[PDB]
Amino acid sequence: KIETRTEPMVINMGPHHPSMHGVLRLMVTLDGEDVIDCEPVIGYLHRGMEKIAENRTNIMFIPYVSRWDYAAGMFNEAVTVNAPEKLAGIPVPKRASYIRVIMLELNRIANHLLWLGPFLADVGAQTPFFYIFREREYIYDLFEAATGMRFINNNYFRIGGVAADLTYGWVTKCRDFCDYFLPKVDEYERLITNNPIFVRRLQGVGKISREEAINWGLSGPMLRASGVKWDLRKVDHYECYDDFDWDVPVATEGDCLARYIVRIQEMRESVKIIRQALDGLPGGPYENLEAKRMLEGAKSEWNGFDYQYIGKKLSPTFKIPKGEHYVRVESGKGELGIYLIGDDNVFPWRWKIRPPDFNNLQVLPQLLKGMKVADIVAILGSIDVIMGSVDR
Amino acid sequence: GVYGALAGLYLLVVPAIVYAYLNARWYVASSFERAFMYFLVTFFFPGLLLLAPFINFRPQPRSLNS
Amino acid sequence: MLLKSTTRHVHIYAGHVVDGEVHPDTETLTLNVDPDNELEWNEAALAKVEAKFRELVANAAGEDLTEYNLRRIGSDLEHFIRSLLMQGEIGYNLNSRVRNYSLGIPRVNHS
Amino acid sequence: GLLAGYQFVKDLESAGALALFVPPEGGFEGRYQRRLRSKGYTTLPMSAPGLGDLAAYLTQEHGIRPAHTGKEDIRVYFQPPLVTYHLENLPPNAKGLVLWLIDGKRLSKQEFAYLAQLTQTLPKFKVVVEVGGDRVVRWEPLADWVAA
Amino acid sequence: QITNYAKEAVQSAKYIGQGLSVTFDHMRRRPITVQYPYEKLIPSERFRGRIHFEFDKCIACEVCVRVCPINLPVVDWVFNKELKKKELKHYSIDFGVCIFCANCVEYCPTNCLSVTEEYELATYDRHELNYDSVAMGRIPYKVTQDPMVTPIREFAYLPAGVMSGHDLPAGAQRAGERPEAIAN
Amino acid sequence: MTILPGMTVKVTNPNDTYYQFQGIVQRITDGKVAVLFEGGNWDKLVTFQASELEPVV
Amino acid sequence: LWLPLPMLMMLIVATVGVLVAVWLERKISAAVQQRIGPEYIGPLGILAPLADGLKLIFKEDVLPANSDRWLFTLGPAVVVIPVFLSYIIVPFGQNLLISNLAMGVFLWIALSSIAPIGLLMAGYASNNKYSLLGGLRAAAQSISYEIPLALAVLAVAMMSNGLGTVEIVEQQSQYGILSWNVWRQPIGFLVFWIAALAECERLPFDLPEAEEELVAGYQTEYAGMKFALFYLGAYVNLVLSALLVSVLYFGGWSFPIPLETIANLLGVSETNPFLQIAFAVLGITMTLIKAYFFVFLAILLRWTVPRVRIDQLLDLGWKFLLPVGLVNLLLTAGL
Amino acid sequence: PAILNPIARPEVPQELAENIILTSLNDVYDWARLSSLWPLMYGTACCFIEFAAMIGSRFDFDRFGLVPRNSPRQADLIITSGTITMKMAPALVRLYEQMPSPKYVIAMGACTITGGMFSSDSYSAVRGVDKLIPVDVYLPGCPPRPEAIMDAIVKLRKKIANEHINERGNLAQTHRLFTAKHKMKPVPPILTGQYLNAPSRQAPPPALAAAM
Ligand code: SF4
Ligand code: SF4
Ligand code: SF4
DSSP: OOOOOSSOEEEEOTTTOOSSSOOOOEEEEESSSBEEEEEEOOOTTOOOHHHHHTTOOHHHHHHHHTTSSTTTSHHHHHHHHHHHHTTTTOOOOHHHHHHHHHHHHHHHHHHHHHHHHHHHHHSSOOTTHHHHHHHHHHHHHHHHHHSSSSSSSOOOEETTEESSOOOTTSHHHHHHHTTTSHHHHHHHHHHHSSSTTSTTTTSSTTOOOHHHHHHHOOOTTTTGGGSOOOOHHHHTTOTTOTTSOOOOOOOTTOSHHHHHHHHHHHHHHHHHHHHHHHHSOSSOSHHHHHHHHHHSOSSOSSSSSSSSSBSOOOOSOOOOOSEEOOEEEEOSSSEEEEEEEEOSSSSEEEEEEEOTTTTTGGGHHHHSSSOBSTTSHHHHTTTTOOTTTSOO | OOSSSSSHHHHTHHHHHHHHHHHHSSSSOOHHHHHHHHHHHHHSHHHHHHTSTTOOOOOOOOOOOO | OOOEEEOSSEEEESEEEETTEEEEOSSEEEEEEOSSOOEEOOHHHHHHTHHHHHHHHHHTTTSEESHHHHHHHHHHHHHHHHHHHHTTSSEEOSSSSOOOOTTOOOEESOO | OOSOOSHHHHHHHHHSEEOOBBOTTOSSSTTHHHHHHHTTOEEEOOBTTTOOOHIIIIISOEEEOOOOTTSSOOOOEEEOOHHHHTTTSSOTTSOOEEEEEBOGGGSOHHHHHHHHHHHHHSSSEEEEEOOSBOSSOBOOBHHHHTTO | OTTTTTTSSHHHHTTTHHHHHHHHTTSSSOOOOOOTTTSOBOOOTTOOOOEEOOTTTOOSOOHHHHHSTTOOOEEEEEOOTTTTSOEEEEEEEETTTOOTTOSTTTSOSSOOOEEOSOOOOOOSSSGGGEEOTTTSSSOOOOSSSOTTOOOBOOTTSSOTTOOOSSSOOSOOOSSOSSSSTTTO | OOOOTTOEEEEOOSSSSSSSOEEEEEOOOSSOEEEEOOOTTSOBEEEEOSOSEEEOO | OOOOHHHHHHHHHHHHHHHHHHHHHHHHHHHTTTSOOSOSSTTTSTTHHHHHHHTTTSSOOOOOSSOOHHHHHSHHHHHHHHHHHGGGSOOOSSSOOSOOOSOSTTHHHHHTTSHHHHTHHHHTTTTOHHHHHHHHHHHHHHHHTTHHHHHHHHHHHHHHTSSOHHHHTTTTSSSTTTTOHHHHOTTHHHHHHHHHHTTTSSTTOSSSOSSOSSSSOSSSSOOTHHHHHHHTTHHHHHHHHHHHHHHHTTTTTOOOOOOOOTTTTSOSOSSOHHHHHHHHTTTTSSHHHHHHHHHHHHHHHHTTSOOOOHHHHHHHIIIIIHHHHHHHHHHHSOO | OOEESOBOOOOSOOOOOOOHHHHHHHHHHHHHHHSSOOBBOOOOSTHHHHHHHTTSSSSOSTTTTOOOBSSTTTOOBOEEESOOOSTTHHHHHHHHHSSOSOOOEEEESTTTTTOGGGSSSOSSOOSSGGGTSOEEEEEOOSSOOHHHHHHHHHHHHHHHTTOOSTTOSTTSOOOOEEEEEOOOEEOOOSOOSOSSSSTTSSSOOTTTSSOO
């Protein structure tokens, strides 16, 4: 039976784990009310993604990739198609580059909204959990129109660009959505900054210094929430993200309150990049791009290498050239990189996914040092974890 | 406790006319009418429970004129 | 600790069972084939898997007592019960509420 | 209404090929394959889109090709004919079997009529093809449903 | 003291007074919800429901197998040297193994394979999902041609301005396909 | 007019998600016709009710 | 066999008051989330409290592996028969009374103290680490919110000059609505309404494991009929607590004259037979209709305040709700 | 032989005689289980978001009577929404055995039917949840639409009504226990509950910090 002893009690968080960020198992040991140690047991969603890619071509592996960070979706397809297109020197058209910025900034909104709902229920008020997913369902139908699926399994990113152009009533439907969602971003911010009970669960709870964040290895809104200002869309001049004006959200506090305000400010800056890309589109709307295809179809300023969704539709037997590689994409959760080295055949020789959450979950034992029992899911909900990215 | 005088006026004949009202105006009702609509459920609830498997709120078939 | 190897048809535990409650031991291994009645057994083939269960326990009695090694025994039993279906010894249960045919569909031999 | 008797079993022995119109939220169709199963009739609930040609599936043996998934040759699993393999396992002291096809509304009318004319040429065998929807669960023969 | 508990109680018992009012104003709004079996929501023009098949179009070349992520579609074909052209005899895509990525409908020259809109495939048996060539060649189930479903539209298909599909009497998508053929 | 399996029709009714999309029809049945729309990347055929489909030459 | 008609007719009202609250829980919480609630069963969910309770009768109520059999079965029974017995107190109706006990607002606060024992033999007897921890957590929470709950009853005991619940509603019937104790005790209503909500509702409770302080609390290893006492007995405690809000502070069976217009939450005709049956039945169960307003307010308050932790729950009953309950008892007196 | 993987002939007559009264009680027995069955809040991989989108406002979870429970005992239905590896394969059977016997597992997504996209070459994925637990309704899709899960609930609801009240005996597991004694060396457990307080994190060891 259960006895009452005086030694520190170890509780198992269990692989059941009724939460929306995967399947962890924390063997966290308690000291009455404070924790003293915690080991995370990962690998419950290790499907062997790296061994699969050594027997997949690139068009056979593009459906596989949007399952690591399945909150994001096409952020996984961004790193995937950028690994042979930056190695073979394949030019991406300018219009397909701006569709990639449009799709990735909408994924970061959906990445942060799937983070936000479970995080607000873990820190207190459970009523925005049903009103946040309604706002993610608008982003689902924007991908369901352009691609053939809601949030993942959307084979849109290609090696020579993107799979197809947008639908007809699409560019006017962010102007219905991202002109309606942007008033609600400040509504989500005033939930925690106002009502000063939530700040007593997030100030100093899971604080990490700047010097320990670079050493432990962090990226995205967990590194930048310690006062680092490192963003790979600004640092790496990545696919016409440098054609816009947008500020990097930094909060030099380190705590979980700094991680909340950065991720809310990433939602706000993403709509800024979206509106600069919908108006900065080269051919504009597709129904107006196709309009100039019929009036000046012989040889125009349109129908060029740009103003189209792909450079050249490559064969399924596209051989990756020989050479090592490491492509980086600033996801909504951090740096999602892959270490591609390929031989001259269609299968890569090694496909090491460097996930943004695998390197942020190793700090979770150190953040759970002196924190309380009710502030364990408040820490784990603020790392923005998706297991499946951690375990692959 | 009456036998069949005022018991049937609360258990039988008035829940049938609320179910005529609940089927017609439940989703089209306004913010003030729905608050009275929730009151008719909780007040006539011992009568609403007996004639529950004898009324269905399933919508009618469409015509498909296109 | 209760090291166990629980597939659909094979539940190998590291311990002995006293009336439902499983107690973790070090010397013994308990096995009940088909917790759900998907296959209609008989007296002949239930002893045929005992010619396989005590064979694999005696064969792998030089290795470690881990969940990986109990899973290696529980897999080869589950590959042996499937061979009893392909030999036509046992058959599928029809009184079960599920008819999902986990060990392959019924099929005739050589068209 | 609500208190249903055993008129569904008698209509199946009369017509042989019924066509239920169940509520689309489910749960009310299966109360009539309990009255059917109480009268000795066993039930094989299959899926109507999953069947191929009903001649080559029900009364003839079919070569089902499993998922080789790139790591196997093209295997051909010759399954027994469905209605005449479940009849031989069915003992003669009990009555026949019924084909409770769900999602019948994606079957063509040529496959509706083939299931209608088969139930009398094959003894102790009936079908109940769940086709379409209605607010109240109701049945009709397949002979006039193809005549609609 | 006693002059504090009449002032330390007001600071949040009125904040829940301004919180009970906003949640009661959440009940004022119409329930934006898709009742499924009586209002099935219309899929998009690119939605990958399930794969269709044309047996009179598949010239036996196994491009669908080589572009599939798991090489799933079984193409059973003989060479048929009397006619010197390979003619298939069986075709099957075992759904349940099928992720609906639809690489086969994209890399096909003869336009045989094609995605439908029906997502309503759910069997009691795993092997009842191994669709035949004549089971995949069956006609899809359209949401609009069903006299029990009131089909509500999807976002990015409504007219410009409305973000709901319930109180939509008419309209189309928020743009025109060919509006500028006699203008420009 | 009647529809043969392989002609290019286009939809005419306004109370439909596919307003004016055109493509090759496929597998005409007793009351229904599926029209392969040839839309962009993944080709999609959608059932119709054998009407509101005006072909072009 | 149920020979007293005042005992049978009350028990029909005592169970249909719970089935309203399970219906009102799943429909008000759906209206604040802009979803339907249970459709397709009954007309609009009327059979959904019946369907959730009847499935727990038909399930194999199996015990855990190594458990104390007699303390596991009597676990939920210590929680819920103290809140099934104190329905003999609640006085709905002018001519309807079951028992004229000399107390009963003190007998209810005495009977509600057996409920922390049932949370101790539910945590211990289930015999896992996370439910014993949830057993000591749930027991020490209802312990904390009883002395504020007993001191709010002490406030309405000075004004009523007794603990008789027939006499308590008799002091609020001389002016209809101006003589209600909520107008005389504006603070002790809040001491009652927070402390009673911290022992029956879903908002200040760790039994939903959204914070993961345990596995699922003390009611983790309970299933079937034993969980039906934990599920359909926490709404018995919700209605019983809301019945006494509508007796102590709000006047039970107290309401003004119904000779009003069509906007009196009624029909259109002044002399209607539908209003002669909505006046006679309302003359039988009136404070149930008033308790349906605080059941509704308990569901509405769940989606407003944050899901507060256990360290600030117990620092509210002792550090806040107990001194504001002590000074209210002095302000109810002369001082 | 004659037929591979044969169907055993049911020799019992299944004398399922019943009057009007007992089947009228069987209808209430089946309706009470199909119409308010409580799914476990379970999810491993991507299909939990499509399952959690059905919890939300656009698609109503609690409309068929489905209330999500974060406990195996209170829930009966368990929608396996996610790819299960070699790990979570003993954890899902443990979630399955801790349920009252009208369980009705439904598989959701391609990776609980045949292990869909990891069915080709993956060293730790069980190919289909039906290699561990019996499944009532299968649901293809990757991921399925939230409308497509509510069809699988409707297909499940039609299966509860087929269940008979006198066929309640096969819902309990049969116990064909066997016993063998082994000679495997017992190993101390690898994952003990200390991570930071382990005696290797405080300082780097000698014969390695000299070259640092
Ligand atoms: S991809 Fe098209 S052409 Fe190639 S085998 Fe398949 S159906 Fe035939
Ligand atoms: S949908 Fe995917 S798995 Fe299925 S046939 Fe097409 S490419 Fe292959
Ligand atoms: S098939 Fe895809 S969506 Fe479904 S469980 Fe597996 S990874 Fe998730």
